[PDB]
């Protein structure tokens, strides 16, 4: 950070000296050995600066030569030092003879200037010294900051006047700096730096003290800053820079003349004092009569300014040169202390310019109220391009308050938005942004970006798309309210934000996109809820309709792909899904009525089921998702019954019989249906998705074992292995009944919760496994059975203790008091013969009281402590995950219902017919949109009214009204007292 | 942010409004005394 | 505190460095958090203020039988 | 050390190291709470310790969400003071 | 060496030390069980 600063900025030394004391101010003796009229350029040499650093009273400071390009300085402040670009620069001039100023003057600085600078984010550029107008500005900044409950002020001071210059000098750089501004000596030769200022520019001219050496650099900096553009590059207006002058002297009239030559507005304070009121009276003369007006200026110069130089015509000539460009000069009308600073500044700026517009200045700053007053001015007439140019400035700089106000003032968005205008908006992506990188990889060419994000799935819609991509939350909020399609747009916005959140490199930014997505999803819920309760039929037509602007896809598709669980959880969507679940038949049809019609096809033509006409009714019943689900459930149960019959009875070592061949054909159609679902649900990508699902994995396992088992049974030597695989295979097939019944509303939520319980089960198994190993090995070690076969040892260590949990306690196998004593083993000790077959031939009797004691402890820990602990964890988990599991199933309901809609109407045993058939192969809409929009306005109006009537808003409005009362009361006190004194 | 949240809290706005009303009452009382004295003097 | 605020906000009155330094000790010893915040904000250099003699007085303000006082006595 | 809750509050805000200071203040207050002869005073020290621990939580949370890498370097760095 | 640095990084990680200790402890219990159930005899160890 500090490397390049000495390289570009050059400090200036005396070099050659002309006189003891030089004309340069340095001592003649204190000079290099190499050392008419002293000249800054001729008598000095430039060396890399050695005073750059950060002060601590943290504030930045730097030493620069007078002949320095302002462009390098501005880049250093904006980029290296981190200071934001100024929306306004107030160059506060002023001599201010005497340490104390008039009360109204100090009031104007603290209340009018500093408050305006903080409100508009402006810069204050004065002398960075604890003297003159610099001290008064500094105390004004400090006083306002304390009462505000930060203003950026820059200080341009000449090096050689700063007290304690040595402590600041460090060629490597002084990032921490120690300064002493409380120096006991008090002299006018040198002054200390002011502690309220944020940055300093110690201009060097090779002098040990002088005033006015930094004027050339200061004027160049102000002129250069006025050439920059406000925000997002060159789109904004030129930065407004104006000079505020209070009192002054003869030298200051030269500064004003130089500023006017540089085309800079000047703001003169009326009644401030000499060198300021002199120009104010000259401006007040304006088009003064020629007779009796030439001498007035000369008399006024002597009257206002001091006696010296009054007789000299240079003062009058300079004033005459000042009036040559009087269009840049304005006088601060006192108005008994108006303190309305910003409006006078606006009048000065617009008058000086004679493109810059008053509305653009309001947009450049963050003062909406100024724009409101300017727009509400009925006398002022605004052209169409005046609003159009201002609206871009609000849009690019992310000012949601301004765009709402500008649109409300009769601005035609249709003519405003042009491809050239749209291109600039997308060029406002800030540096390394997600949209910027996607645009670079992709004229904006935004359409290509959307297709890659969404996957192929009206000026307001385009602006909403632009705001969503740039993550302008408030701007995207406003554009959605003015859009035509709202429910689809809200869900579409959620899909766009969530998919781009997954692509966000910055975790902080991804949170903001997800936060904005939640707001859009909620409003889609609230808006649809308002729409649904007014008319269920019209609300239904809203969801299934295809929105052409997004992807020509229904709102349900957008919600499903955006994982909008809250959108699927409301009653309106669930009721519609139930209606689509039943197809043409009424949603209130009893289940037993459906079952009777299913078994008796002729019954569907009678009146127990409420909905060529006969053919259409026939296809309506058998095409409904519920009847397809029932047909598949009945078929699957028949498949299991056939599988069971073949396994238990029909399976023989002989070649397969008729029933086995039917089972093979039945399983073949099941595989084909599973394959069809995977294919239509990118061959490589589809296969990865299909294998990802756990339910598909068990289905793949189920068919895999069936193929392996069938092959084994056909092999002559592997008949026994064939049945063993099929017996396990039947277990997997039967488990799949849970997956089939996930759609049902009664069993759906419960099945999903069971999966969430697996964490508690694994902990219980781990705790039980540790206890089983400890108890099982210790008991076997104490008994020391004489069998000691490895399968026998494993059975007595794991199998027998496991069964004791479930009430199978073989006391006769582990207790000496129950078995009979025998001298079976020749090994020394006492032995007993258990009666059990697998309990071992003999067991030792040495410490069987410990074996019994271990059994007592094992039963307490396992049968009571561990089991009851699992119940406690199951109860806690069930209560916690009940709400989320219900929401997850409700969101998943649409996918399951849609899946059953695409399934063939024929049962899996007969599905080979349908599989073969699959092979070898408006004004009403506008009225619906208007009806939706009407409800949106009512929903938004109710939300706004509730906020306005909220207790917080009433408290805020009462506070502001009390402020207006205080201002009115204070004016009454001043007016009454003055009138009473005048009338006395 | 913590200071701004406290300042914008409902309790703090109520406190500031109360003090401002007090300053209005002091100003209003002074106006009543000044107006009555001036009216009597001018009569 | 309001009296100090009005006195400090008086631009005509100029305050010396020792004027703030002596006042700041009085706020520190007497446990006045509002005053020390206000005095520091008015351009007071804490680096020059704090001296070992100044620090010794601050630790001498431990009130009678206090935990810090007993630990200091044992130290 | 003197259990000036508001004064300790102000000085922490102006300090350079803050996350380490907040945790360091918690250690100092809690260890001296165990040594407090008066139960009423020990409660005040424990109360002040809870305030310092919370702010260390809030401050680190603000630091973490801006940059996980820089926040990590903050925790493992050794505070010399 | 980059290969050596990667080797020490893997085996120096706390998780791999934890896994190495868990595997070792399970083997110790298996050895303890085998000695107790079978290898233990009144004869010298």
Residue numbers in the entry:
A (entry chain A): 7 to 25, 33 to 48, 59 to 80, 87 to 178, 182 to 386, 393 to 480, 500 to 514, 557 to 710, ...
B (entry chain B): 1135 to 1177
C (entry chain B): 406 to 480
D (entry chain B): 568 to 648
E (entry chain B): 766 to 810
Please give the exact wording used by the authors of the publication that reports this structure.
Here we demonstrate temperature-dependent changes in the structure and function of TRPM4, a temperature-sensitive Ca2+-activated ion channel. TRPM4 is widely expressed in various tissues and has important roles such as cellular depolarization, cardiac rhythm generation and immune response. TRPM4 and its closest homologue TRPM5 are monovalent cation-selective channels; they are activated by intracellular Ca2+ with a weak voltage dependence; and their activities are regulated by small molecules and lipids. Like many TRP channels, they exhibit pronounced temperature sensitivity, with activities strongly intensifying near physiological temperatures.
We determined human TRPM4 structures at physiological temperature in different functional states, including the apo state (EDTA–TRPM4), an agonist-bound state (Ca2+–TRPM4warm), an agonist- and positive-modulator-bound state (Ca2+/DVT–TRPM4warm) and an agonist- and inhibitor-bound state (Ca2+/ATP–TRPM4warm), at resolutions of 3.1–3.2 Å. We also determined the TRPM4 structure in the presence of Ca2+ at 18 °C, as well as in the presence of EDTA at 37 °C, both of which yielded exclusively the cold conformation, indicating that neither Ca2+ nor temperature alone shifts the cold-to-warm equilibrium. Given that all of the cold conformations in this study resembled previously published TRPM4 structures, our structural analysis and discussion will mainly address the warm conformation and its ligand-binding sites.
